[PDB]
Symmetry: D2
Subunit: 183 residues, 4 copies
Amino acid sequence: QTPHYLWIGCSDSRAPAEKLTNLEPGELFVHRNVANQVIHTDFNCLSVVQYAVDVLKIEHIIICGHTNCGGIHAAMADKDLGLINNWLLHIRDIWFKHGHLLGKLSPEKRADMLTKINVAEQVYNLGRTSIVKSAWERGQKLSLHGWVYDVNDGFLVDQGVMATSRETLEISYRNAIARLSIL
Amino acid sequence: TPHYLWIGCSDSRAPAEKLTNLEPGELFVHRNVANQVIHTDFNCLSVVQYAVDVLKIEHIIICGHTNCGGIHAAMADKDLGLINNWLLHIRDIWFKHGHLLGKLSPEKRADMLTKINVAEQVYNLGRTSIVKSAWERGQKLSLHGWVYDVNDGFLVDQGVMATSRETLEISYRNAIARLSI
Amino acid sequence: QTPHYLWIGCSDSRAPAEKLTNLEPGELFVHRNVANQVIHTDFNCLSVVQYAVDVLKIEHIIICGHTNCGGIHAAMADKDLGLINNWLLHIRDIWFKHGHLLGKLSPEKRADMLTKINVAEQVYNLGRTSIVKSAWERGQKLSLHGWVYDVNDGFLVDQGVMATSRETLEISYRNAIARLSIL
Amino acid sequence: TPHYLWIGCSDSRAPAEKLTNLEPGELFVHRNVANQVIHTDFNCLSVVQYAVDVLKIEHIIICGHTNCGGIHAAMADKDLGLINNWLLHIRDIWFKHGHLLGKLSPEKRADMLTKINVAEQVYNLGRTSIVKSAWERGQKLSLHGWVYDVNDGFLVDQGVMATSRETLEISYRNAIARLSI
Ligand SMILES: [Zn+2]
Ligand SMILES: [Zn+2]
Ligand SMILES: [Zn+2]
Ligand SMILES: [Zn+2]
């Protein structure tokens, strides 16, 4: 009967999409990876993103991050854990990009802050893929969402990110970071 | 903290999550089109590293599934941009086992390839430095490969199942051998 | 003034394209990588392949392998040399694909045989990229060549591979392997 | 056997091969659009491993170049399929240093970004496990980053040049600092 909502969660056995949502079982494409990333040059993910947009003709993509997250912790620490270092170097660039903002916060609160920046940045990445641009620019309906789940509090009434167009992607992304920067 | 890594297809019809009779939080999931493990795919090899090294998983399960979008698309003849690149890896497998699959009926192929695919992905899994090393340092790691027959409801052990490189060769070679009955 | 011929050689300080060819300096796009591969899911290469076909509008791609080659040797040996193992696992699949044929040859002669299979297989890969298919199928001129260079003998008057269309790619590829199999 | 690894752009105008005044056979070349080293790029990281570990190279040079196809295409606004994905990494760099590049003239950006790019690729190079490890086992490895100004004929030391992680920080930070004169 076909799925209508793509979820991109973290491999960290978190965002049991199934369970966190509770919508219609069978209408949820899922992809999971360490720190729930959308990297410009990742076939794996983009391939999913493609199948979901072009083929299954989906109109929603949630990227969902979470707090107390292994990728983020791994990303912030130094242990060279092999391949995963490469993968997380992308997250470390995000940390550098917002170093100033993060660069003044109880270090405890930094992991959770970075979890949030990240969800914004991946939506921003997602939104700049040819896949998605093409789709919008050809008049197809597609909405993007960035949410952060916490095991204690549920979903944070945060600067979510929300993008239904190239123009809205921008505002949203900016607003998101703008909003996170206040302290 | 979880003992299994599940590697499923993005196609939505395999919710291992309950299927099994195990748990969540004991389940560390990665899902991608056609449920592949590609030699040079950082996305997935990354999931497999965190699994094997950080969490110290004991079982990695690759789960294929019948009438699968990915599999069908692979044999379809029509460009879908990026997804085609990703699916060429499954075409290579298709060609590999061509004779076998010619000796077969057009609509029955779908399913066969689904099986073969699982076999082949496990062989890929088991040749990764990651896995070959868990093994050499004597970590307990078993690799399992199943197809979910969405039609009959039940899963199905394909009996690829490996615990070492030697046990990897035997299952793989035996599986391919068996799928030319 | 623009280039008209893409060369894909081996990173093994071999196929100094420049020098091996001697055509018009400035009209040679080059990419090099270990064992001179064209992998289905490699952005790096495909990106070059794209720039060259779509943008610079090239009409020739040589993939050039060579004999006594580090990638091939590495591929055939067992030392786990880290990342490169992953990369070469692709070459090892080619070895498995032609195991029977290789599987009866003075083991010395195997490395050179595999060097040749490889050049065929990469052309075959190249030829099945959307990039190239799209190009042909839209009536653009594009020729593909697979040659093997030897330091002692120069270019082997071998089953080269040669493909100007989807249909010719096939014949050529088959003919190539067919031809290599005789002993 | 060779002592240098050269990492150039595919754009054809940088034939390091003679440019230098060194040699071939002492030169192990990898060329790709916009002369990038991406964190998760197996193609290139592979060249860099073979270089550093197998051949035991002493110098890795990343060479950018003025009016570069890749750089221009990055700032162009027009989809070119796959190449766009690859070029988003250079857009991210562009944005990163946006203010600097706004404070600048439309046609002069081209060149600046070319410089910045080199700076940033070297920083990428120097954060790879591969390189960070050569260093910890005390191998001699220096990383250099140059722009070839095709117009004036001459190369140009950008004076990113690193021999350790600490020496990597200093050059990088100093370079960016200097390119906001
Ligand atoms: Zn996580
Ligand atoms: Zn499927
Ligand atoms: Zn070579
Ligand atoms: Zn260039």
